Design a protein around this ligand. Sequence first.
Ligand code: QNO
Ligand code: QNO
Lengths: 54, 54, 57, 54, 49, 446, 53, 105, 423, 146
Amino acid sequence: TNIRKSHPLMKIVNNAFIDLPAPSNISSWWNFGSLLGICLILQILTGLFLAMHY
Amino acid sequence: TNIRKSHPLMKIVNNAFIDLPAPSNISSWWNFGSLLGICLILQILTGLFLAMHY
Amino acid sequence: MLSVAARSGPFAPVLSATSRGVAGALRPLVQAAVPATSESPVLDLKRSVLCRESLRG
Amino acid sequence: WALVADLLTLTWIGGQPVEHPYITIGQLASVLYFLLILVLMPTAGTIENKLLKW
Amino acid sequence: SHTDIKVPDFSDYRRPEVLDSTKSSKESSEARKGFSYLVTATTTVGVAY
Amino acid sequence: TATYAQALQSVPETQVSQLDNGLRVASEQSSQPTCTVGVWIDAGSRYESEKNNGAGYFVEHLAFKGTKNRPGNALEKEVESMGAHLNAYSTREHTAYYIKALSKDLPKAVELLADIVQNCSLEDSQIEKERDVILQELQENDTSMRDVVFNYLHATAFQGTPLAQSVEGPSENVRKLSRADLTEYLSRHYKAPRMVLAAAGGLEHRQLLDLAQKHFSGLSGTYDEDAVPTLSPCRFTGSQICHREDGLPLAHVAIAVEGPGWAHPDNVALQVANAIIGHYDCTYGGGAHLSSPLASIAATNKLCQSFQTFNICYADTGLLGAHFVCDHMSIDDMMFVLQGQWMRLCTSATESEVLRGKNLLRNALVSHLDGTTPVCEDIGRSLLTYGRRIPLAEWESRIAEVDARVVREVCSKYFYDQCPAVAGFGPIEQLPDYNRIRSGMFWLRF
Amino acid sequence: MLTRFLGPRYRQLARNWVPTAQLWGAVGAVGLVWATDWRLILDWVPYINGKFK
Amino acid sequence: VSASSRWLEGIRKWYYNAAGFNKLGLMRDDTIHENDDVKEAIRRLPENLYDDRVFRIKRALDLSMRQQILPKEQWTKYEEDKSYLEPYLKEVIRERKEREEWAKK
Amino acid sequence: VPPHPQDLEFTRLPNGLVIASLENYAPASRIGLFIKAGSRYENSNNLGTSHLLRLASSLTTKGASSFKITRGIEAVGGKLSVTSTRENMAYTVECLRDDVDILMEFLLNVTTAPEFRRWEVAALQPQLRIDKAVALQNPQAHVIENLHAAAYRNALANSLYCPDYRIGKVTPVELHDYVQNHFTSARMALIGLGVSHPVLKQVAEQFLNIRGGLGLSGAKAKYHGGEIREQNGDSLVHAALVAESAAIGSAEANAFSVLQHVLGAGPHVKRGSNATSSLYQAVAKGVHQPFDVSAFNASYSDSGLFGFYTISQAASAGDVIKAAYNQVKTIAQGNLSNPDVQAAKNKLKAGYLMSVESSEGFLDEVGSQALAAGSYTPPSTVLQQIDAVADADVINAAKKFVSGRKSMAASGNLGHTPFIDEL
Amino acid sequence: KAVALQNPQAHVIENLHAAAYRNALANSLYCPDYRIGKVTPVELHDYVQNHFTSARMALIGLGVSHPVLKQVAEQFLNIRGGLGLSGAKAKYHGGEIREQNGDSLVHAALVAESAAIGSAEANAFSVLQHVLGAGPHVKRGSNATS
Ligand SMILES: CCCCCCCCCc1cc(O)c2ccccc2[n+]1[O-]
Ligand SMILES: CCCCCCCCCc1cc(O)c2ccccc2[n+]1[O-]
């Protein structure tokens, strides 16, 4: 059937951030999880740009 | 049952290099696949050691 | 007045391409949803009655 | 194998100065490469079909 | 007896345009939709800049 | 050989006639030795009030249980003893009592119909007995998942309107409702300009009138006046109701967006679009090869046990959608497909498929008006809802107009980016979240 | 062997998707224009002449 | 009929012999690249055939593995080579094309 | 002011094929090829072949592949449906007139050019399971299926649905043989509604001259008697008790047809006491609550079963069967009215007339007649026929029921359902 | 049941019995398919109190001594408040059950009501079986005495 549910890559993404079930319940204290990720890549990004001059 | 077949990490490894089916058939020309990987990490390794002095 | 089946009672299975499969001869059931409490599935491992290819505007 | 050798040829020409034979011979290796991959192999393959009765 | 089923009264959350059982929601739709769309539209504009 | 076109003109014009009363007596004479006469009333349940509710339904139960002139059970005895069939149904918008009978019997047929529709002996003995029954009915009804899900769709689609109500009402009214309540509903609603005498068979239209005049003279004549209210518009809501119950082995889901009422011209187009999506059932022959993309996909990957599109018409609104049934792990996919099909029809309906649907509609149209009863019931209903009786030829004419564009247009008007009314029953753990179903009501591509 | 896609329907398909395909390029360019402040192009837009000359 | 056709015939009997599947007891249809049309045709084969074809490919893959080849006596003789899949493959395609044509109108 | 109608035209070809048609100027057409290939022609070695057959009506034919039959038909909004009984099979195709030419073709390909390809048929066996499942979800199906299996040892005992042990086991060769065996000119009839006689005839003579199967409408059912009981737990016990009656067509079989209507068949008024129902009144008298009963009446080419079918709570079963039984027994005793037989007569006829109001209904009547009689007997005379039933005739029919070897099938909590023995 | 009914004889004898009686002996050794998943613990409870009582019980000991069994019995098996007799009393009836199968071999049993166990007649019958013949006595034999 579909596309998002069977494509080897897409599945992965889909079962991790699209369909994956989560408590209707969790509060703001469940943001620093993804905020950590943002911080990881933002470090990685600026970090990379600083390195082409450092 | 087992351990190697159900542990979230282990499975991965197991279904990619332990149990995964392969042609009883393939020849030497199926080595540069893994040889490429070796080359990737060997570059990465020495590459890393050269970088703490470069 | 032949038509063994629509002579009311014996069984007459009907398969279709477009419409739904039928089974339908004569024996009561009829004066039975009257003296009530005759359940029925609601599409339990099943099909669908009345079936279609009857409409309007 | 023509593709291989043509590549062995191509490498060799790549490693010789832009003068004498080497210019035109390289210009041929070139066309051949493209001519082989783009027209020679496909037709060669269609023929093999007609030879098998496929 | 599934006919005892009431659908809870919602006035308490309903936009003003959708409060009367007497009239269509057909009319208020464009606007209600426009409003929330304009909201994201602008948001993207903001994200764009 | 007589063509289809030509064949449409062959159908005899439906004779309509007005009583000095408000009764419209109509007919479609044919050659048959048998026929169907009955009364269609513009009484329903959208006409009843929160507490009145179940009235008509309670009245329909009482309808054949004795009149003033024909008491206890002789009504049956007479009807039965002449091998006639007495029947009655009632919906949110219409009520009908009809007799199936030998053509020669048109007279007493009518006499009977009159007596029923006018002199209804709602004896306390009965009205009492009857509540125990209607209670039972509701208990059985609760097992038909389908029956439930459609009531729920109605229940939430029309949140707040009278239309939101069911035909039988909640147990409460069936238990509390009194004769005064009944009597009142009859008097309020069962009046001439709201009822039609319809027939079909081997009868000369003149006879109908003679009878119509003979036993129905005496309704609105000296009546009507003040206390006759009109129909209030009903607000469609676009919500969802999910009655989770994992004890049931299959799920019923039933989605819809508000459609326009009976008389709107864009129904014909909506119906063609519908035919294109079609229906399905697991006893269908041909799976993979069904034309309908839904039907096919469904059948090939087993995404359901049966689905079916629809278009329910009411006064100035209606529900328009599909309803399906399936394994607990197939509600998503099933929804996915159905939804994507609607949009495809909104954004890119191809020319060829629209012809199939027009063809499917003609075959249904014609195939359905086969036999006195359906025709008789089409006359009545037609008069109540269209004001006229729309001749086949016209429907063809109407269908013909419709082409691809017409579909993608009308479809887009009703289905594109509109909020649905969702109704789910059964093991709906996987029925998509409402935002999600709503987000599926349009696509980012187009 | 693209002839599989050569028939009436296919024509009607691409036809229906034409106004959309058109609009998607209208989004696509204006988007590149504005993200690179296209000298060559922007100058013509009445306002957005924040480059005097 | 004469020199001309036997010429093309032996060109083939050559290319065939040249192809070399024979030396691993294969048959031309065993070597066919499996796509959709093919895959279905294989499905449609009867028990015996199917069963035979799997033992055939199995022998070959076993050969190809240990890089041997079959004794000359047992190589597969050109045109003693049964073209078992063709009728199915033909009809499987035949079918697809119909839906394909049906899809254009 | 409708036009005066036309007449059905009817033709027997020397080869045995019957052809009949009617030009109702209908905007649509119905064509049905009726075949004597009903389930009774299966045998201990191929039970179900006619089921899987009934189901294989859109597998590929020579000259029409599966896809096309499907796509082809749907394209014109037409329909293709095959319906079996213990005696016939009826391939009925329908559409608007301008389109018969294309349905008539498919029709023929299916009935006369079926390929039954291995992998298409394998693909379909499962549907026997799904199909039967869907059908057997009404107790009556099994009961009548068992009733029949009990009553006969022969052919009429064979079931409409494929024996479970046979699912997945009926072969394409069996389908092949079943067609050559039974779908031939002398066992075929071709009915046309909305087509013209010269066409059907031509179609017939061009396309339906097939012959080399068997010959008669039987192995000739041996009646036997006996009873089958299914322990169930359905709260309601379904039971049917019955005796051998009269073959279809015959005069006796209208005495019986009249009887059913004295004893009582279906209801005629939504939710009624069924005042004019000998059985239902005879039951309420002694039984106080949920129950239904009706006289049962099957009639085949060379036999028939008669009696009544009851549904009641597991403990009243006996009382209901025993009360039901005596009522018939009481007509056998001569206690039959006259205005009563008269009333019956009326229900019957009106019912019959009613039965063919519609096309789909009329086409089926003509189709079966063709095969049962090789005639087309107009309503006027069928009615004239029902009229000839003497009150004594009815009594006698009942007398026959009451006195002849019996057959019972029942399913539910049988713990209070009597035994026959015990009847 | 699956494992048991894989010998034709099981069903045949099961059906033989269901056919022969209307009563109690007709009940089957294996649970009716419609009952699987439906027999309740209360039914088990009732079935025990109903039938597992002193007057319907016997206790046999091989390799134990009488005083022990007796003590066990008197201490532990004095249970009583179920039913009383060895019957509802089977009503014999007759009849026959037939299963369409396709097993290449047809299994069939034909039978009449005989004599109750214990009784003298039932040894006349027990003797008969051996005249007519029961099992084989010699690996692969003609069964001369049969
Ligand atoms: C914009 C970049 C996104 C950063 C991380 C992506 C989010 C995925 C992490 C999770 C994981 C998880 O289990 C939950 C549960 C609830 C809510 C959020 C959330 N995540 O964000
Ligand atoms: C010592 C480090 C190992 C390098 C790569 C690990 C090997 C995994 C790659 C594969 C993948 C694959 O499909 C095959 C198939 C056949 C044989 C080897 C092989 N790999 O090695």
